[PDB]
Amino acid sequence: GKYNLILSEYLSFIYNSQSAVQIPIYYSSNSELENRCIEFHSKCLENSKNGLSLKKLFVEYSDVIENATLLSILSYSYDKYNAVERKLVKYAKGKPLEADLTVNELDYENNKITSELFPTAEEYTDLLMDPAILTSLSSNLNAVMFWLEKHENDVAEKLKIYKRRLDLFTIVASTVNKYGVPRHNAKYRYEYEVMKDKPYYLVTWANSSIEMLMSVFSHEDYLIARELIVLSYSNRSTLAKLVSSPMSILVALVDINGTFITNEELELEFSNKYVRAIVPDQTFDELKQMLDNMRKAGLTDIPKMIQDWLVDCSIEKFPLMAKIYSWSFHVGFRKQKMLDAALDQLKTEYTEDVDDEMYREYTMLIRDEVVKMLEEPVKHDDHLLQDSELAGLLSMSSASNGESRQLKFGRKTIFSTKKNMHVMDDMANGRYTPGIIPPVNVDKPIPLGRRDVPGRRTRIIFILPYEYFIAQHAVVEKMLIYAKHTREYAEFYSQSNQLLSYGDVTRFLSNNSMVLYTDVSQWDSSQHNTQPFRKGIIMGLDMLANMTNDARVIQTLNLYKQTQINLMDSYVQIPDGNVIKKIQYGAVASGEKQTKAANSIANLALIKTVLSRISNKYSFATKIIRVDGDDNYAVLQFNTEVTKQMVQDVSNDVRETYARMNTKVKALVSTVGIEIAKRYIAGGKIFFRAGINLLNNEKKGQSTQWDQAAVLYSNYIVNRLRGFETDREFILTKIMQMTSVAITGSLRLFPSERVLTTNSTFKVFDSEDFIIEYGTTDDEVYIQRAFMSLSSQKSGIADEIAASSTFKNYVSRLSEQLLFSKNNIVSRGIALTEKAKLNSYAPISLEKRRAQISALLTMLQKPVTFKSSKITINDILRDIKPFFTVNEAHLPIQYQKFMPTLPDNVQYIIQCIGSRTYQIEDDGSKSAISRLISKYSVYKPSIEELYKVISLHENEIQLYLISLGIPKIDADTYVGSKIYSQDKYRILESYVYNLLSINYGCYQLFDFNSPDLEKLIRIPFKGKIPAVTFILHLYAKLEVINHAIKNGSWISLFCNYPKSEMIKLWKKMWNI
């Protein structure tokens, strides 16, 4: 309830004119007050529409000011062009900045003038520095200047923040004012004709610098920001890659004193174990060279902080490192060219000096792993291998990007890259031919996509046809669904938390063992991911083919095999001007159904093969190896105690034993820590990388101005929890500026906190961070009922595509691969399901969402609507709340910190109740009926459809099950058992279980099975209504936790809930 005051001050500051007028609009769920709001509205518009002073009425209608709820504020203000400079000249009295063109290796990666690199606009491209966000730099500057203006009279630590950010913003505004501000077009692009006389990389530098200086709260933050902002203006290729590299060594220097553990059964369990840090001597010399590069690039204060920290190697000063490790990735992306980014990967050194003893074992281990994965389904003759074709055609992801193509649906032309639409096209013209796999050769090389991420290389993406997916689908699904019952993969270690993705950095650590951890992200072009990998899988397929007798399965397996045959020789379309290059690349990357598990397999075989060579010089027992695609760590335990020389020699042996296979590596051995791209542990404490650029994006999505405010707030929340903290007021300023909409050149509307923070399809943020909010009042109920009525909208483009011939044909062809006695129950169902993935096509989503926003605006302008009773969640919570009773409590501190970078209130909760004892309610459609259909088919009929289908007679249900391949005897047994009344109740239990509101970012981490939280929740037991008592206890926990987060103190609760309200609520439970 504070946002709106900052909104008012922002409006007053930005416009400032006599002509700038401000027009509230209100609402109330109470008839009389609502009609008085209507009145107020009318009279205000009239008075505005009559050149009368508006300031007189504002006293008379005090009632609206006290009890009504705000929606929005309108604004009539004229063009007033160029006001940014007219404000900004004062905050720019320092000296501007000069680039240094002789820093980056390439020529165009320097921050030189555009015209020196792009004389013609026809060859200009903003894609090498595109912020890719529908908000301007001028917007960012306006926000910064307003913040600076309002914080112009404070005298505290706040003033030290203001002086620091003022000096930084002076450096920035000095750099911009040297030339001026670029002006956005309607699309938020920056054309050639504005950037012609300015540096090419000024905008990204500006945005990133704003993001950094808005995240300054201390002196060391100021040092970091001044030392990165002045070098990120020139260096754009060797900065985040440089400073983020030493961290991998630093983790091997932090003594553990107190630890968190994880079980095989995936539960945290703290340990007071102490572990030293047996670091060798030569890695310090490496680290010094890295700091020498750091100083040689032009960094002075931040080497000083890393060198004076090593005098003590304490863990209390250590979050600084983590802080630094996050300050590197908030400088922007290194959006270089498709060509040179591919050539970062497409440099190869293949040699006739490697072993053969290694590759043969490698091939065999891959073979064996494949057989372990595939023994059960290949043998027991599973439907999904038999019906692999249909399985892949249902699971066609509708963003999949195979080969842009000119289509026509009746009377249109479409340039879709989506493979579902391509399949719809190819079914009609007789070209659908999944058994005949296309080649990938000179006659048909592959396109590319570009994956950028700061501090690392630009990675590449294959863009394949749609036959390869269909071939790979069934086998890879059985592989995943097997190996998540098994070690060595992220599918087994993943839900949200600690006790997961790693969960065994910290069992097998002491002064007996070590751990070798290794980044393997460059190992895609390597000589060990070519021929042996493919031939190993091919051999395994031969074994598995001889391990079955049915013929569709042999066909599917032979097609997967032939896919690996064709992918063994693979060329790559890349244009360059007029001519087209195609390069020999017979190796592995993503853009495939297979890449994750197969890379994990190959790395597993590789590390298992390497690890049988250290045994020639050491005695150890391998306790654990873990592989998640392109990373790997192995722990190993010894017959004796560890030394510095053994770690060093082991590292050299690892490096040279990879060198024997012509494989580059930075071998890293340690005792307490690891480092990988996204996270790391030091001293038995998990930190994380907070490298999510807010004001600069990777690529250009398809969302609106609106939703980008929500993504930016989500990234803010994440980065804040991770450690990187930005000023929340700035984020709110951006949200209002991005939800602002131009109805004309001079009319502009601004919504309020009570529209953006309400649970709907229009939610953007929350009134109190780290807490979703619900509604006990009339008013949230009112607007939620209103907005739920409006979420359901239409798309004429979708309507005409779904009314064409190819869509009908597609449903029919899907159908005819199965039985032919259901025509109005599933064909409509499959069409309704395909509709859920036609919306991926951007113009459909844009039509629907622009229509949705227009429907919103035609009740933001004029008064509001009651929406006719359509029930939602807050209706229920409104009835649950008035039988609670609070009392002040006092919990002690008995739980350990193991995520230091969190805010102190969240940590205080962790420091008073426990971290996660994880639970499960359903691992997907478990109840009675989908685990039969998923055994005889793959089809996934929606629970709406089942809730209807069970309500029908038992005859056409019997027909429907027989139509899905099932025999008659099991249907007869199902009807005789009388389970349909049970699966009504199980399905409605599953409907209440669909409430996903346990995992938003702060509820993600808290343990609700705690005894300390539970003794506060004194709700007596009634019985025979499990859903209600479940949700009541859950909701009471959420009340306690949210009060704790927002206020720190604790409370107890009590709900002597009447039986009458249990029953009155029971019918609204299992609806909506």
Binding site: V579, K582, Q584
Partner: peptide, 7 residues
């Protein structure tokens, strides 16, 4: 229409 080759 035009192409280039590498091996």
């Amino acid at each position: 229409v035009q192409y280039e080759i590498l091996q």
